[PDB]
Design a protein around this nucleic acid. Structure first.
Lengths: 368, 732
DNA sequence: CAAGACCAATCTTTACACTCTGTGAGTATTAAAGTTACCTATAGCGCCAAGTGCGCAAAGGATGAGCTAGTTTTT
RNA sequence: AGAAGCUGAGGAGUCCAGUUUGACUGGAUAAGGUGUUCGCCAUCUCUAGCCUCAGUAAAAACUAG
């Protein structure tokens, strides 16, 4: 794709910035009065106003522009058809497993790297007179000058709509380099967001050596990225990643299996047990699940003891339906690839039957 | 016995996986490039297995750096053979040391017993990786494993378009590799002595002759394969379709006593063959397949339980597919390749197993032709075929001619199950509104058919979370459930509706059921053919029929016309004169100028009388349309026909008037009034010819056809748009 | 803490300049035709003006109604 | 250096350890058992292992039989 002046005049900016084009005025940047500063632990999330000229431009860029630039198959995050299960699937054929993480992935993306990556797909011309270029005008809708990070200048912040696509486009080069490095060693490599998973099917201690870490660090130093030394895992014949267990006993032509730990399913089992023991829905929805109806959210008093009950029932049924959808997604993944343990399949079939029975009982009780 | 083949980032493949192989796997599709690429991938993998220097394949995209080919082998029978305590041989122990040694020494004493020795299936996975610098890597770094896998699972490829009948190399290759004899125990000297003894006048002459020949022709010694081929040739008594039949029969026969399971690919088995020849080929293959089957009571010598090899077919003939589906049944599958939106080969399975024995026995060439299509239109009656297959109508729309129309009932649709191959073969099911709602006259209430209830149940989705835009479907379902009573009022003695129009409900149900690939017409085919805007054309067609088809029965036209004019009144008794003078005949004689003028005057008088009676008896001009579309086996508004009204005993006056019209004046039109008579084709051709004469531009005639016939033109336009949307993917 | 290893495609080819029509020794030296040339597309619902919008979210009758929202990963 | 760590603010009861006669500080309830590459890991069984208030942005896959 090659975006020209008319494309930005009609498609990218149909009505938001049409006033600034005929008047021959430069496109303004995003001011500090239009972005929120949500905080979560040691993380800062930037939220833009839902009614702003830049939000519509970002959505149009995401749908029409940042969806056709080719990517690398090793990236399985924020891409249509990608999933965590597809991120774990290729490593079932390996006997040794290694995991790596990138420290401050979004905060360390250089803006000039983004500009260079997006330059070939944008025509080199002046959008507004002889003062502002088309590339700069497009790029002013994705960056932000962080008041807390003025030392680093302006960066692409997490919480915007166009950040993941830009991250994938920027990191395509590093993905290609790492894949080329791993191909010669016979190591399967996959990436989800900023997490890298490496699998070795042969009997060797390459993944447990410091040489692999040094090589990955040297590769990542071209674009200024660093690894996190507190999240380095290297094991053999079994690995656990956020409750997903991948096992392979070893041997020539051996196929591993993927299952879920018991701790991964602990909350749903507790909810099912509480529901089968006739526990009030308020306690179930407040203790196990983190859903609570604050009194401030109430707008009109009207009637009191009829909306809380239906709200809690809807939240419970939505939670159960979502977890059922997750389990049947696992079942569909098994049907497509056949890399799931049989006993786990029996267990999840029983759990699905129990969940469906509980949902039917909840619906019948609500109707009565 | 391969189970899975996976190709990633090679040629025209992004990520393609093929599994669940059967014995008679068949490959069909429009994208031949995909089939060629799959064949090339398989041949490249098997050439790299045997350590041959070949050019690496190309990449689909250059934004990656690897291309992987993965093969899975079902090593279950070999494991059972080797691990048995009864078999003590060099080859068995070598196979165990090569295949099952590494994977078994890493297990404890619990998984080996009672966990992998009861019903488990053993798999062996081999991966081949091609890098950006044309480098080839294996997942297992042991040539012995690759050699053993190659010699245990051989691959054979047959091309029938370019095949030399003078070369029997595949036959000898199959014979040499499927024998259980050690030919190294036959000493050369003793055989030469035996031959010399058999033919000689003096002892030793043959041996001396052979020695003299060898001393001059001294070359490289025979290999083992050459020796066994020579022994087979001296043992046997002699040496396109016949070659393929012999290869298949030998492959089936020789593998009954061996643990080697070959894989065979055949390209175009029907090139330059009569359809009967292809059917006989498939039938003979099936008979030989069933001869060596030992199942249940079928036992005795010559019958085995050894698994059969895998065979792949690449065909473009519906006859072979029909025979394979009818004969093999559950031991076959059909594959469809097609493309994607951006351009990439796919692989899908088309349903070919049917639980109805009648459908399998009545299977014909139309069902097989349904496979080789890109857009299928399913209809119920035979009038839809006559309407949608008109040549003149399809001449103006070169986009609906790429779709095939099939007559299917509910049971036929259930057996075919078009929903399985939805992404490969798009389809649309066209039905009538009567199949969902039934109306009654004695009781003023609608009723819902079981099909409507099934559709509502399918649309209803329990065990779900909230989603914006899904509550409208629930509201529509609730309205459909609550419209069960729907008290209304019918005027003209249960003939019309007060204000329902059956149009808003039809539009709403069409919008709801568009996701299920269904379309419910407001009226029947005859209702759409003749509407309020098509009365002039229908009248012109009737007038042309009267002018042309009606001829004088008597051989002398002038005398008969004069006698009947002097006998019957020209104005009051015009109907008896028309009945007793003009008759329908295939041949139309040419009369004299005066006779032609008299006949034209009589025909014009008859036309004037009929039009005056039509416009006088009926006034609103809508009852005319109702009577016309009801006399041609149709129902309108209330969903009632002649027989249904007669059984219900309603609208006596209207039925009596229609009977009088049929049996008094339109006696000649009666033969062209029953279902499946042929009036649809004639009317369509006449209308198209008239509009073509009136308007020259294609856009003008298309617009006029759309104005005259809204519903069928709308259906054709929607189908054409759907075809154009998916034209790029379903086209090679 | 620094570090070799810094993507693919960006449209595709093809080709001497002069005055001499056969020969050329720059402190830093591609470019102009031809043939193409690609597609992006929409969200709650209903209504009347029929998509460029307006109203409303109580019916209804132009600003009381009433008013939830899945799992997991990255983070 | 560098890197994490963390959605926070708390409160009641109880236990342990320390100072200290009188109060403070630090650690703690998705329990118990088994095996472990010792990992914030895996597996098994219950009767399912405390409460209050603030905050919650973005992109993908999943509604099967």
């Amino acid at each position: 794709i090659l975006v020209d002046k008319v494309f930005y005049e009609k498609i990218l900016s149909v009505e938001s910035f049409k006033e600034n084009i005929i008047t021959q005025s430069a496109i303004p940047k995003i001011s500090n009065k239009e972005v929120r500063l949500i905080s979560s632990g040691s993380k800062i999330f930037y939220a833009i106003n839902n009614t702003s000229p830049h939000s519509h431009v970002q959505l149009r860029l995401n749908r029409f522009f940042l969806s056709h630039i080719p990517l690398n198959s090793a990236a399985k995050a924020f891409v249509r058809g990608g999933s965590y299960l597809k991120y774990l699937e290729p490593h079932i054929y390996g006997s040794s497993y290694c995991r790596l993480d990138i420290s401050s992935f979004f905060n360390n993306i250089s803006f000039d790297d983004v500009k260079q990556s997006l330059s070939p797909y944008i025509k080199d011309e002046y959008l507004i007179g002889t003062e502002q270029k088309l590339i700069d005008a497009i790029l002013n809708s994705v960056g932000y000058e962080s008041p807390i990070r003025k030392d680093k200048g302006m960066i692409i912040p997490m919480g915007f709509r166009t950040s993941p696509a830009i991250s994938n486009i920027v990191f395509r080069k590093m993905d290609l380099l790492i894949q080329d490095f791993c191909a010669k060693k016979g190591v399967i490599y996959s990436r989800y967001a900023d997490d890298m998973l490496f699998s070795n099917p042969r009997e060797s201690k390459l993944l447990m050596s410091d040489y692999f870490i040094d090589e990955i660090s040297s590769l990542l130093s071209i674009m200024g990225f660093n690894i996190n030394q507190s999240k380095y895992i290297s094991r053999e014949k079994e690995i656990s990643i956020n409750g997903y267990v991948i096992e392979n006993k070893g041997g020539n032509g051996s196929i591993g299996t993927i299952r879920l730990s018991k701790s991964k399913l602990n909350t749903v089992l507790k909810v099912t047990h509480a529901l089968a023991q006739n526990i009030p829905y308020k306690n179930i929805c407040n203790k196990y699940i983190k859903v609570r109806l604050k009194e401030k959210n109430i707008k009109y008093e009207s009637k009191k003891d009829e909306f809380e009950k239906k709200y809690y029932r809807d939240q419970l049924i939505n939670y159960l339906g979502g977890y059922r959808s997750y389990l049947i997604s696992l079942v569909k993944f098994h049907s497509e690839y056949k890399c799931v343990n049989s006993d786990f399949i029996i267990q999840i079939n029983g759990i699905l039957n129990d969940i469906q029975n509980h949902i039917q009982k909840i619906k019948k009780n609500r109707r009565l | 016995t391969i189970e899975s083949i996976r190709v990633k980032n090679l040629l025209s493949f992004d990520d393609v996986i093929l599994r669940d192989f059967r014995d008679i796997n068949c490959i069909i599709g429009r994208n031949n490039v995909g089939k060629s690429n799959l064949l090339k991938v398989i041949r490249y993998f098997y050439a790299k297995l045997e350590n041959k220097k070949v050019i690496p394949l190309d990449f689909h995209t250059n934004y990656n750096a690897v291309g992987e080919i993965t093969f899975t082998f079902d090593t279950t029978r070999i494991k059972k053979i080797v691990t048995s305590r009864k078999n003590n041989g060099r080859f068995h122990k070598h196979i165990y040391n090569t295949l099952f040694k590494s994977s078994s020494v890493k297990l404890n004493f619990e998984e080996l017993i009672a966990r992998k020795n009861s019903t488990n299936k053993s798999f062996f996975s081999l991966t081949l990786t091609i890098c950006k610098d044309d480098s080839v890597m294996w997942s297992v770094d042991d040539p012995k494993v690759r050699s053993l896998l190659a010699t245990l699972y051989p691959f054979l490829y047959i091309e029938t378009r370019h095949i030399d009948l003078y070369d029997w190399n595949p036959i000898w290759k199959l014979i040499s590799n499927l024998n259980s004899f050690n030919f190294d125990d036959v000493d050369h000297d003793e055989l030469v002595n035996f031959l010399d003894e058999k033919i000689s006048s003096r002892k030793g002459d043959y041996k001396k002759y052979i020695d003299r020949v060898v001393s001059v022709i001294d070359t490289k010694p025979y290999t083992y394969k050459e020796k066994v081929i020579n022994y087979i040739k001296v043992a046997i008594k002699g040496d396109s379709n016949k070659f393929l039949e012999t290869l298949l029969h030998l492959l089936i026969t020789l593998t009954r006593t061996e643990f080697i399971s070959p894989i065979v690919y055949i390209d175009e088995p029907e090139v330059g063959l009569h359809p009967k020849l292809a059917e006989s080929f498939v039938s003979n293959l099936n008979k030989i397949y069933s001869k060596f089957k030992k199942t249940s009571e079928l036992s005795g010598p010559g019958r085995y339980k050894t698994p059969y090899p895998n065979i792949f077919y690449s065909t473009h003939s519906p006859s072979i597919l029909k025979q394979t589906i009818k004969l093999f049944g559950k031991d076959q599958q059909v594959l469809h390749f097609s493309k994607k939106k951006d351009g990439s080969t796919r692989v899908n399975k088309i349903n070919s197993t049917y639980s109805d024995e009648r459908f399998l026995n009545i299977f014909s060439d139309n069902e097989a032709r349904l496979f080789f299509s890109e857009y299928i239109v399913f209809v119920e009656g035979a009038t839809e075929l006559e309407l949608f297959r008109n040549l003149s109508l399809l001449n103006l729309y070169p986009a609906f001619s790429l779709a095939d129309i099939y007559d299917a009932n509910e049971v036929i649709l259930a057996n075919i199950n078009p929903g399985y191959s939805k992404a490969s073969i798009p389809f649309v099911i066209i039905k009538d509104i009567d199949t969902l709602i039934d109306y009654s006259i004695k009781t003023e209430k609608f009723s819902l058919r079981p099909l409507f209830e099934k559709m509502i149940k399918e649309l209803t989705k329990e065990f779900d979370y909230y989603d914006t835009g899904f509550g409208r479907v629930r509201k529509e379902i609730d309205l459909f459930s609550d419209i069960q009573s729907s008290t209304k009022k019918h005027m003209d003695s249960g003939l019309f509706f007060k204000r329902f129009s059956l149009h808003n409900l039809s539009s709403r149900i069409n919008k709801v059921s568009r996701k299920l690939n269904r379309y419910f017409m407001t009226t029947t085919i005859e209702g759409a053919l003749i509407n309020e805007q098509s009365l002039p054309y229908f009248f012109n067609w009737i007038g042309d029929v009267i002018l042309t088809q009606m001829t004088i029965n008597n051989p002398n036209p002038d005398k008969f016309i004069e006698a009947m004019r002097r006998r019957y009144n020209i104005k009051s008794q015009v109907v008896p004169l028309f009945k007793s003078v003009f008759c329908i005949g295939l041949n139309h004689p040419v009369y004299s100028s005066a006779v032609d003028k008299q006949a034209l005057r009589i025909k014009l008088s008859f036309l004037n009388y009929l039009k005056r009676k039509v416009y006088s008896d009926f006034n609103n001009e809508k009852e005319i349309v109702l009577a016309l579309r009801l006399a041609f086996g149709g129902k309108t508004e209330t969903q009632y026909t002649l027989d249904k009204l007669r059984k219900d005993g309603e609208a006596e006056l209207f039925r009596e008037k229609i009977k009088n019209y049929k049996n008094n004046e339109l006696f000649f039109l009666e033969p062209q009034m029953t279902k499946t008579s042929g009036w649809v084709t004639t009317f369509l051709n006449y209308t198209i010819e008239k509009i073509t004469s009136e308007e020259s531009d294609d856009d003008r005639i298309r617009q006029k056809l759309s104005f005259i016939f809204p519903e069928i033109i709308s259906i054709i336009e929607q189908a054409s748009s759907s075809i154009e949307a998916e034209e790029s993917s379903l086209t090679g």
